[PDB]
Amino acid sequence: GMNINPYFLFIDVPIQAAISTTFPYTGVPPYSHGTGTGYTIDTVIRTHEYSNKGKQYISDVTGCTMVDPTNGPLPEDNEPSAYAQLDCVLEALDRMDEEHPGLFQAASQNAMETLMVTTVDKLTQGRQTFDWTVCRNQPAATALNTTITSFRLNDLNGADKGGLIPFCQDIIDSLDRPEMTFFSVKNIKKKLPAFLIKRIPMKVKDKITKVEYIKRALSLNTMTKDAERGKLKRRAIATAGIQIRGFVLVVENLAKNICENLEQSGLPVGGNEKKAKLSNAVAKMLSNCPPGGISMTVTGDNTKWNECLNPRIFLAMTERITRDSPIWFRDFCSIAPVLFSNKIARLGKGFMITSKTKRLKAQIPCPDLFSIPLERYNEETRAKLKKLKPFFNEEGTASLSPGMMMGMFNMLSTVLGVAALGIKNIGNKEYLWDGLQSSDDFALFVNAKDEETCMEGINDFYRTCKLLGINMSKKKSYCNETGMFEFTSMFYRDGFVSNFAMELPSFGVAGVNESADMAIGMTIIKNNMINNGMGPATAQTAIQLFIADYRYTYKCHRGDSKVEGKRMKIIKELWENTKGRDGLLVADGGPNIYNLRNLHIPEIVLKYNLMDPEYKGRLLHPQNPFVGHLSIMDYDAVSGTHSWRTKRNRSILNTDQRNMILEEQCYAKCCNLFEACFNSASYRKPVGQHSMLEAMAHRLRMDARLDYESGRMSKDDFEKAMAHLGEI
Amino acid sequence: MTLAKIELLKQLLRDNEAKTVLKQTTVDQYNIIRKFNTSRIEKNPSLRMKWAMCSNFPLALTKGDMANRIPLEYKGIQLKTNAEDIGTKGQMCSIAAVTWWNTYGPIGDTEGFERVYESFFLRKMRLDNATWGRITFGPVERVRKRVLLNPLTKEMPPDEASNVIMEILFPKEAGIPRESTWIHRELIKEKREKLKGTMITPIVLAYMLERELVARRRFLPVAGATSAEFIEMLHCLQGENWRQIYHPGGNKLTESRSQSMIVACRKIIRRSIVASNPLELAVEIANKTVIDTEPLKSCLAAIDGGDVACDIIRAALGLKIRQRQRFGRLELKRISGRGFKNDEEILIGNGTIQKIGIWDGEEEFHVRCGECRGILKKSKMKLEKLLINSAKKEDMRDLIILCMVFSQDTRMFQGVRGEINFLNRAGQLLSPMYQLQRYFLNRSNDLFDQWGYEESPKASELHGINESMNASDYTLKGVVVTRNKVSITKNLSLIKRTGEVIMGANDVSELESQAQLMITYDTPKMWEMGTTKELVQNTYQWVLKNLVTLKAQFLLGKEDMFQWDAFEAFESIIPQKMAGQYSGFARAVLKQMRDQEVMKTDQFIKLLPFCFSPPKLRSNGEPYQFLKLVLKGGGENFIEVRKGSPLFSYNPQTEVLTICGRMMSLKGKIEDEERNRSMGNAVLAGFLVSGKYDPDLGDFKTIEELEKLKPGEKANILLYQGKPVKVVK
Amino acid sequence: AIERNLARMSPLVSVTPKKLTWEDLRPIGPHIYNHELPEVPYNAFLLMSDELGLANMTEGKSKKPKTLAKECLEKYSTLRDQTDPILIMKSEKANENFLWKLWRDCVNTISNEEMSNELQKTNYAKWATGDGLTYQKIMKEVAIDDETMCQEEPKIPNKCRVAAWVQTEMNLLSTLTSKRALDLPEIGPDVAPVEHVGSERRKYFVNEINYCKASTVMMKYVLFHTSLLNESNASMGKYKVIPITNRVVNEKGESFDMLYGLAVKGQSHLRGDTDVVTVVTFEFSSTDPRVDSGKWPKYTVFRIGSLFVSGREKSVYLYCRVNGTNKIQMKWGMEARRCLLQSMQQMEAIVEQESSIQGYDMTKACFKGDRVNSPKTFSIGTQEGKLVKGSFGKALRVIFTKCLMHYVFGNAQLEGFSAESRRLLLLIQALKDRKGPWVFDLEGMYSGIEECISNNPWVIQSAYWFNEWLGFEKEGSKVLESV
RNA sequence: AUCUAUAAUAGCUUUCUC
RNA sequence: GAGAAAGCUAUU
RNA sequence: AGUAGUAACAAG
Ligand SMILES: *O[C@H]1[C@@H](O)[C@H](n2cnc3c(N)ncnc32)O[C@@H]1COP(=O)(O)OP(=O)(O)OP(=O)(O)OC[C@H]1O[C@@H](n2c[n+](C)c3c(=O)[nH]c(N)nc32)[C@H](O)[C@@H]1O
Ligand SMILES: [Mg+2]
């Protein structure tokens, strides 16, 4: 019998042209289950393993055990090395400054001016952030607000000025406070007959000491990363609190300003701009190859990028880069690597111990990890805990001075990698290297007289990176003749090929509402046509597939279909009633009229002329109750009845939140009244250092004066209004 | 509703928590407390939506009179929650409720939707009133450029647009009256008078206006049509292997037509100057050239402007030339003076060195900027004179700076202090002169300070003017205020009735640019006007299609198979300096292949197009030797004589020819004995393989060390990696 | 400073370059050839090539799932009325009696006149779904005092060898059938010529895909996952019978409804995205499990009757299996239609390339040929150790089946294997292009690849196929060492 | 010649330990 | 329990 | 049981 071998496609087609078949993205992405404490402890152990030949001491600020690999002994093998040499880093930075005059000064000036014009609310632009007040994770705005309230409680008022600099000054002054009073949350627990346990939260005033607060402010909360493709094993990511996020922004901006002006940096360019930049760089490397010579490309990734990069090296880099800046800006840029050099890792949820005979299970948290004899753990967990014990703090946290926990200095690390790329030669040998760096992934282009000198250059680059604490992965890197390589999952074979599978997960129904999902899906198809090699036939098939998935997701099959459903009865009634059936939306059982040419027109606009007047009036009703109408006098919402909102009432089981809801509703009412007074606040962020009450009072007083002088209000109600305003 | 708002504030200030929030939170901290949310937003919203659509009441209803019109039940389908959760809980409904509203709900006015989404209706109008041309299958070379996404009424920077929107919709809570916002004052007024009694929510109107006034520019792959009217249809415009002719609706600006006309004229000149009798070919191509939808001749006649190539095409078509140029905000018309552009390294005030093309010679231009006029005489890297007529002050200084940066003088170059970059973020070149023009519009104070002054002239109707925007005793150097048939020859040179040449074909710029509008060459040889990669691919495909007859003609004849139309198109992308040398080298290689009967089909195909230009040998008669043959544009555009190349590669294992990323099967039109046939017989001119590597001779000889070897001398030549071969002359 | 530091760094710190050769490329995962390991069992959620659909000619009305199952079982009344169990094979830790009682409960609940597909909480249903099997959670202090409570050693996916059923499934799913299962909705009318070209290509592409068994399997998975998600959300604390159904269309256009089996959903109180709901599946089949017992360790098979298609009858078996799903798997099963896109884009691009070389549309030429161009052929497999070439449509169906298998057998093992083997594939391509690839640690590459080969049938079969293809590439490059 | 400038929210992709 | 950065999209 | 895979769910 003839047996099918799919890999035989690669006999007829080069791999790059059919690379999409090597991305199994039509399958379910891996997910993590349960705790991430094992991966976090593994990360701590590995981070300390690459620095154990450094200098070990005890911090006199927090009492944690600190390891310093910088300026340590040079490595003697090919294992990951964290022993960066300060002089070599300085020399690479000096070469970078000599190749690009005035780059560091321009970047420092831009960063300083941006920091001057930066407001506190920038800190609200993050995802889940570690909140030190409750020692939990909370959204960035909530964490920032709790921090500001606590600082108000501790006689710190730098947030009232509105700028980032006074807030950071108040942060580092809070680090000096002998005590910290704040608002924490207590959960009242009830034995509910049904028995179950009912939790009701409430805010209370809590207090911590100086060292405890310092350890909390330096703590990173670790959790597990879900839905990551390409990895067999799961891994833990980390999040920082407000105290660190306040200072990471400026260093990130400085490094971004540097990276924008480097021809070897793959950041912060992305998408088509990144493709154009990489293509131009590759063409330049091809043109500049010496006549009669050879050129090699190394597709490389750096192993243990985050666990080997040391924040002390970043402190040195910031001091070298901001050489010609004022003292205050230099201190400000030095704060962030300093805080990272004393960072403390929260180990996670703990481990669960089970009794199979009795079918019992219990969660042992990180503070109680060593209250259990180590014989009651797995072999792997037992070994990890034994290795962890020296760095373990009796609060359930570990000391993690070495390393960068997870991707906080992508730009600055890219700068370090590009500095490694800028040496270009060692000892005046007969080769020259260049290339591209994006975070840790890199492409190295080495031009020489033959293959042996090219390999000499690659060896020298490997050793030079070793000097900087950068370890090229010999397993995941390879080298060949220039003209074909890989870089950040983009495959170059005489020009970047299209990788269609990478965008496959985006082709589903987005899940905003019926109106938004249609536009998003059509726009996705259009953009994939433009810049992913998606042909017209595949695009039309994608339209069909999107319509099928849309109808099954929103239960809006065609009006003439006999599909049963609660919505389908009314849809069939609308189909029978409606005379102009071609003007009905797909969400109301109408036909799909999208094709390639009209992929950029919204559905309602596209069907507006074919629409029945009665159906058009019902659909585009300015006062339909499915769209939130802004009010303190109702305004007209122009989007149809399909722009509804699934109000996310997150009812996490067995927990009745009655006091968090109270504070949130108080904030919501105050903000809604403020918007009512200041109608522009939702379009432009209001500015001012005065209270919201006084701003609203003056706005109301002016409005009353003006609408009394224009004859919009009588004498009596104006008297009442001025009396109420004076009563405030 | 001032009284209602004051009552609301009094009611709100009855709680110790609301009072504390209002008193302690500053107006800046409103942007914090409005995002306050104790709960995390649910991740994976597509899964959440698929889960919630299977629930009973996933949708939230706003309480009001319109919600009450929805019945609690309809034919045994519950549409919303019962009266238990009217208060303190929040009412919810099913999607069947939305369908019921669309079917039996109350009917309102669909006005306000038409004005808010007017941009989309204009997009639909452009799509519907559009004409589709034919579809072509063939290589398309797309470049990634930053392009405007959608056409715009008045493109404004986002800060100015934000201020204008703030003026239109929230004049009371606006702030300091920035001067730039007054520039659009009239427009502002119009919009306000159109929104006097609109009950639509202000924020939706604000984003409607922002969509109407703010440009969205993105990096996208394009090929020959970069105007926003074509960018909105980009997905249907072309792919990597096909093109679709599209004629959008609406009205097109004259700038787009002029730019497309210039690009088309330059391409026609580049194709023509390579052919025997370039005038005849240029006229033939121009007579069948369509810009968007109109013929090239009509656009040339109607538009007063262009460049050198436009004037050459105008003369060839029999029209009158208009020696008028553009410098963005400056229109210059030449009077007398011919010069050449040479690229040299020029220092700037910041200390940086930039490769700039500066024009040499003394020339004079009548210059106009808005309502300002003057004359300008310039020399090479030295401004001579600028006479100015009376005009408005800001236009006066704009024309002054435009002319003084047009002169390309050392004072202007060294008066640059700040941050100027001539490279795109994607490492693409920005024209230095235009960048300097843009910079000096907002920072001309440093330029005028660096320029200096002198005593004013004392003529009759002449007075000096200073940067003090007033009649001053002192004036800067060079500025003086004054109150009061061409026949084109065979080689596309413009000569007067006397004999002097005004402009030639060598004067056209070497730049390759994308036209704003789609250019169509209604000729069966349209592909000859494409880019370098497309031309190479089409030429090699033609060679493959006619391979049998070409091989027969070459093995029988000697010279007539070197002259073909496809090769004539191919020669237009070989830089003219090296064309003859390449032709000599390739002809010698092919002849030595034929003479010894060693015939390699891959090498014959690769080197055949280069054997078209007249040969250019050396003094001794031996042709030049090459390792790679460079083509116009881009560092990846070259043909390797021995190895593969980004444009031409050959796999003898599969007998597969990769040309510009496309695979062509050479199997069948080939003898397998050629797999056992030595490559070194067709790598050098007059050289044949002798044997293996000989340590006696030593190193592999380079080209310069090999051209000087006398006949009968052995040498080691490395064909490709790991293939050491010894060769003999 | 850098020169001085490199002058004193030990020479042992090296990149150790090695020039890659064909002789240095060894087969991946040798343990998959070790016969001391069990053959990898069948772990797919539903039957794919062993499925048996009971066909009932529908009247164009989407009546209801319960009514549809009732009509299909009424047509095959002999299978429905069989009440005694004839056990053919038994899963190791399974209860045959409880499974048969559950099957009878499903049949009776779907054959009655009531409108509810809910089952009662009987002892056999409770055993099958798994009731009260969660561990009781106690306080930390009690557990710390209790020395018996220990951290559980995690289970590791065991190592398995190549099983021929994966090759047979690949052969059968890419074969043409006579039924169409795709339900692609309507598209807007064509105006631009590019849209006409797209429609002309779609004709060929979806006509070739629509008649392969993989398409029917994909539709079965999609519709069943839709039904399962809907039932899990609507019926959290009820046991529901969910028929496994499909709607197919003959070449004559007549529509049929196919009943592939029944399913029972346990309690679905899925708070998290990884929370598991138990699904007990009873699938009809005509494959005797005794032919390849190593394929079916997870299945309890009864013989429930006989069917007639021709003069020779075929036995009808009931494969019963306790299985599980979560919300993530159900959601990604609802959107398995995208296996089409990755299949056809990859193929359409190929066609487009040919068009650029010819100057006209090459879809008909690629699929069927024309006067100018011969039909396009691809190496698709091996017959008796020799390369065999199939048509363009066969290759399209093979790629579609490969994407379908990526969905069906997708987990972390497949992802890791795909990444590492992709790196190896790029190295092999560089070897084929004569780019002279150099490696730094090839043993590390192979170890990374082989870390992911444990018990995923598709990963093990992909390793086997990769080894075969690599052998063919070496044999083909043995002639390239002469130029 | 798009070079400047660019509010917030949400999604998708990529990179960031095995 | 689900981070950082970049690009892109939608929305207000 | 099973899903699954370095740790969970198999209701709270
Ligand atoms: O888009 C490119 C080009 O097509 C467009 N362009 C050029 N000319 C016009 C006209 N006349 N109308 C509308 N659009 C036009 O602007 C871009 C210019 O690129 P390119 O043509 O490649 O520039 P080129 O290399 O040819 O000249 P450059 O020095 O950059 O300046 C372009 C513009 O400025 C004129 N110019 C400057 N100087 C100092 C000149 C001079 O001393 N003598 C003459 N004859 N011209 C001078 C160029 O000629 C062009 O007019
Ligand atoms: Mg890495």
Ligand SMILES: [Mg+2]
């Ligand atoms: Mg890489």
Ligand SMILES: [Mg+2]
């Ligand atoms: Mg990487």
